[PDB]
Design a binder for this molecule. Structure first.
Ligand SMILES: CCS(=O)(=O)N1CCC(NC(=O)c2[nH]ncc2NC(=O)c2c(F)ccc(C3CCOCC3)c2F)CC1
Length: 288
């Protein structure tokens, strides 16, 4: 659209770029605020979707402050946070993130998800780099994926099996799956399912959880991309998958990784799991 609408913002650094667009750190020249700017290069559905997201205000969701259309670009102004979970896990890789902080982050993300999901809002794209942390121990959901993307990276590792099997109308359960994969990664300091193609992702899931069938996932053999020629792997023990997670955490993770989206635990039920009886909010050691 029109010109000059972004002149109030001074870009201070390009944080990254990719399939999502470009992310900048910026300063409002008139108010002095430090914000993140997302730039999308150039849709009625997306306007409605983005408008609803601006109304979703929750401690564990990165606040979307403004939406500005200028030239061939759409800019989204977000509250700034200084670090993502990927960098924090890398920085913690020698010692591990202490379990109380893992549990705090997992709890808070389930709160954010239960809130989104109660509004029928899906994130769709959860991974460590979509999770931002601050010095006060908060963690926040960032860069929600829309039902219809728009605009002119091995983002497979956290994708739910129903997406890989061609489900067109998937559910909030896909976010619970992704968060389970992130939970396991925080505990073990390795990606749970580090696939490098859609089929390698699916087959890594199958080799660990067992090839799904109609007993554990009714309807699976009818899904658009299921092939009867899928190899039949046996399931392994969770004691092998995420050691040394205690049995409360293994139990919760098992429910987050159910094949059947009808059986996979909801964010709301997950908040009640006994793993969270002793949840606290620790302060992370954050180097900025
Ligand atoms: C070594 C890097 S860092 O750990 O030091 N760090 C320093 C700077 C930090 N802050 C922010 O980006 C930030 N603050 N408020 C909002 C916000 N971003 C976003 O809201 C955001 C976006 F609009 C589009 C795409 C992505 C991800 C980009 C990566 O791919 C997955 C999607 C986003 F996050 C994050 C990382």
């Amino acid at each position: 659209g029109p010109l000059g609408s972004m002149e109030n913002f001074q870009k201070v650094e390009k944080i990254g770029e990719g399939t999502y667009g470009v992310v900048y750190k910026a300063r409002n020249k008139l108010t002095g605020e430090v914000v993140a700017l997302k730039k999308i290069r150039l849709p009625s559905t997306a306007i409605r979707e983005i408008s609803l997201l601006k109304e979703l205000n929750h401690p564990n969701i990165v606040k979307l402050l403004d939406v500005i259309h200028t030239e061939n670009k759409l800019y989204l102004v977000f509250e700034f946070l200084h670090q993502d979970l990927k960098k924090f896990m890398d920085a913690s890789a020698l010692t591990g993130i202490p379990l109380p902080l893992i549990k705090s982050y997992l709890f808070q993300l389930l709160q954010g998800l239960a809130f989104c999901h109660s509004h029928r809002v899906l994130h769709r794209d959860l991974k460590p780099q979509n999770l931002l942390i601050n010095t006060e121990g908060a963690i926040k959901l960032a860069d929600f994926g829309l039902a219809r993307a728009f605009g002119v990276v091995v983002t497979l590792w956290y994708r739910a099996p129903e997406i890989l099997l061609g489900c067109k109308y998937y559910s909030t359960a896909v976010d619970i799956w992704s968060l389970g994969c992130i939970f396991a990664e925080m505990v073990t300091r390795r990606a749970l399912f580090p696939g490098d193609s859609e089929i390698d992702q699916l087959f890594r899931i199958f080799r660990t959880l067992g090839t799904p069938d109609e007993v554990v996932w009714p309807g699976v053999t009818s899904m658009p991309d299921y092939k009867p020629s899928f190899p039949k792997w046996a399931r392994q023990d969770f004691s092998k998958v995420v050691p040394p997670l205690d049995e409360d955490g293994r139990s919760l993770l098992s429910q987050m990784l159910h094949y059947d989206p009808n059986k996979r635990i909801s964010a709301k039920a997950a908040l009640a799991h006994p793993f969270f009886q002793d949840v606290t909010k620790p302060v992370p050691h954050l180097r900025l």
